[PDB]
Design an enzyme around this catalytic site. Sequence first.
Site, PDB file in Angstrom:
ATOM      1  N   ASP A 235       0.804  -1.174   0.000  1.00 36.68           N
ATOM      2  CA  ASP A 235       0.000   0.000   0.000  1.00 36.68           C
ATOM      3  C   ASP A 235       0.875   1.279   0.000  1.00 36.68           C
ATOM      4  O   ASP A 235       1.923   1.315   0.646  1.00 36.68           O
ATOM      5  CB  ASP A 235      -0.824  -0.069   1.277  1.00 36.68           C
ATOM      6  CG  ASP A 235      -2.023   0.737   1.184  1.00 36.68           C
ATOM      7  OD1 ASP A 235      -2.131   1.466   0.172  1.00 36.68           O
ATOM      8  OD2 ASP A 235      -2.859   0.648   2.116  1.00 36.68           O
TER       9      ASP A 235
ATOM     10  N   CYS B 183      -7.888  -3.501  -4.411  1.00 37.57           N
ATOM     11  CA  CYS B 183      -6.852  -3.475  -3.408  1.00 37.57           C
ATOM     12  C   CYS B 183      -7.528  -2.867  -2.175  1.00 37.57           C
ATOM     13  O   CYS B 183      -8.719  -2.530  -2.235  1.00 37.57           O
ATOM     14  CB  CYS B 183      -5.683  -2.590  -3.874  1.00 37.57           C
ATOM     15  SG  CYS B 183      -6.157  -0.868  -4.274  1.00 37.57           S
ATOM     16  N   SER B 184      -6.785  -2.666  -1.090  1.00 40.21           N
ATOM     17  CA  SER B 184      -7.426  -2.327   0.188  1.00 40.21           C
ATOM     18  C   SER B 184      -8.402  -1.136   0.068  1.00 40.21           C
ATOM     19  O   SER B 184      -9.557  -1.227   0.478  1.00 40.21           O
ATOM     20  CB  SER B 184      -6.366  -2.049   1.256  1.00 40.21           C
ATOM     21  OG  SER B 184      -5.586  -3.220   1.499  1.00 40.21           O
ATOM     22  N   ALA B 185      -7.924  -0.017  -0.473  1.00 38.74           N
ATOM     23  CA  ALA B 185      -8.787   1.179  -0.614  1.00 38.74           C
ATOM     24  C   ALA B 185      -9.468   1.230  -1.983  1.00 38.74           C
ATOM     25  O   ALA B 185     -10.470   1.946  -2.153  1.00 38.74           O
ATOM     26  CB  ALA B 185      -7.977   2.454  -0.371  1.00 38.74           C
ATOM     27  N   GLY B 186      -8.944   0.461  -2.949  1.00 33.84           N
ATOM     28  CA  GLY B 186      -9.469   0.466  -4.299  1.00 33.84           C
ATOM     29  C   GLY B 186      -9.109   1.701  -5.128  1.00 33.84           C
ATOM     30  O   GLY B 186      -9.777   1.989  -6.110  1.00 33.84           O
ATOM     31  N   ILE B 187      -8.047   2.424  -4.773  1.00 31.52           N
ATOM     32  CA  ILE B 187      -7.669   3.594  -5.581  1.00 31.52           C
ATOM     33  C   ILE B 187      -6.187   3.735  -5.955  1.00 31.52           C
ATOM     34  O   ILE B 187      -5.887   4.139  -7.069  1.00 31.52           O
ATOM     35  CB  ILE B 187      -8.195   4.964  -4.977  1.00 31.52           C
ATOM     36  CG1 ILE B 187      -7.673   5.164  -3.559  1.00 31.52           C
ATOM     37  CG2 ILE B 187      -9.756   5.018  -4.984  1.00 31.52           C
ATOM     38  CD1 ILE B 187      -7.820   6.620  -3.027  1.00 31.52           C
ATOM     39  N   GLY B 188      -5.273   3.418  -5.037  1.00 29.50           N
ATOM     40  CA  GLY B 188      -3.855   3.615  -5.317  1.00 29.50           C
ATOM     41  C   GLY B 188      -3.342   2.563  -6.277  1.00 29.50           C
ATOM     42  O   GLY B 188      -3.038   2.840  -7.439  1.00 29.50           O
ATOM     43  N   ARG B 189      -3.270   1.342  -5.783  1.00 31.37           N
ATOM     44  CA  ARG B 189      -2.709   0.261  -6.570  1.00 31.37           C
ATOM     45  C   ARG B 189      -3.624  -0.098  -7.719  1.00 31.37           C
ATOM     46  O   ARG B 189      -3.142  -0.393  -8.817  1.00 31.37           O
ATOM     47  CB  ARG B 189      -2.424  -0.931  -5.675  1.00 31.37           C
ATOM     48  CG  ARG B 189      -1.237  -0.627  -4.722  1.00 31.37           C
ATOM     49  CD  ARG B 189      -1.167  -1.599  -3.575  1.00 31.37           C
ATOM     50  NE  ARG B 189      -2.250  -1.362  -2.602  1.00 31.37           N
ATOM     51  CZ  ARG B 189      -2.472  -2.133  -1.541  1.00 31.37           C
ATOM     52  NH1 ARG B 189      -1.680  -3.192  -1.311  1.00 31.37           N
ATOM     53  NH2 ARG B 189      -3.482  -1.849  -0.705  1.00 31.37           N
TER      54      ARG B 189
ATOM     55  N   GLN C  34      -2.254   7.159  -5.950  1.00 29.78           N
ATOM     56  CA  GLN C  34      -2.162   7.884  -4.699  1.00 29.78           C
ATOM     57  C   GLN C  34      -0.939   8.795  -4.546  1.00 29.78           C
ATOM     58  O   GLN C  34      -1.051   9.889  -3.986  1.00 29.78           O
ATOM     59  CB  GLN C  34      -2.304   6.897  -3.533  1.00 29.78           C
ATOM     60  CG  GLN C  34      -3.814   6.676  -3.211  1.00 29.78           C
ATOM     61  CD  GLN C  34      -4.053   5.700  -2.081  1.00 29.78           C
ATOM     62  OE1 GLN C  34      -3.459   4.644  -2.044  1.00 29.78           O
ATOM     63  NE2 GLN C  34      -4.912   6.067  -1.140  1.00 29.78           N
TER      64      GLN C  34
END
Length: 286
Positions: A188, A222-228, A266
């Site tokens: 992350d 992914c965890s937040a669904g935006i960076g990766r 991100q």
Amino acid sequence: TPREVTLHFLRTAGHPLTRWALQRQPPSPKQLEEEFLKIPSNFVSPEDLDIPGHASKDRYKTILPNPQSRVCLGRAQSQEDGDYINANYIRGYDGKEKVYIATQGPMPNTVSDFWEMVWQEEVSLIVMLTQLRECVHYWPTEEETYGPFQIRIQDMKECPEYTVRQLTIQYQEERRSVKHILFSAWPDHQTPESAGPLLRLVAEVEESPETAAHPGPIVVHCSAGIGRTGCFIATRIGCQQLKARGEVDILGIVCQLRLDRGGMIQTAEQYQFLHHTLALYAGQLP
């Protein structure tokens, strides 16, 4: 008119880079940092969503699905009491609609919602981005039921950089194949260790057989669904641009992703890594 200002920027910003410039004379690291900082988030405020109790279905309080592209659960297969999942439709290469759905990794209480989305949207490929130390195990070891759906694992194959699982999902009489790719070693707020494995992941997606007349979106999470998720999608679209046109507009790609889901990609380091990855892909083209 900050919203008007945001939308105007995202709809018009661009910095086309020829294959040559990308490989041999890219923008400097400082120029890329300043460029990244100028891109608006397009985050939605809690006020722009009128969905009671959605907060229990969000991993993060400030990362919310833009209403304009939000995936709405129609509940055709269930009696669940709303339409909410933290997920958005994402346009692909050339603005093609609903090529991806970007979403957060399911929470224990949204696993059934996640599979309901997979069924409703006729998804046949899921790409999961994670790190070993980290998200729930929302697929079974052998076979499990999630709400009305039976999920079975048909095969599991460990590749150097990712694991491919062949799953099936069944509702009543109908059983569908779903390929699941789990890419680990992507922390992350960071980049992958090198671009090679990312490009092999993109190739793995590309070579995934398509059967449907109207292919459903590819789920990327992914965890937040935006960076990766944003880095992965931007990489694939950038590769498609380079292959088709011999140039890429990375700033434009990121802007279009942000119109689809606020906050995609991100960090400035991730944005610089996209430039590195695509310079590498460019060398592979005839």
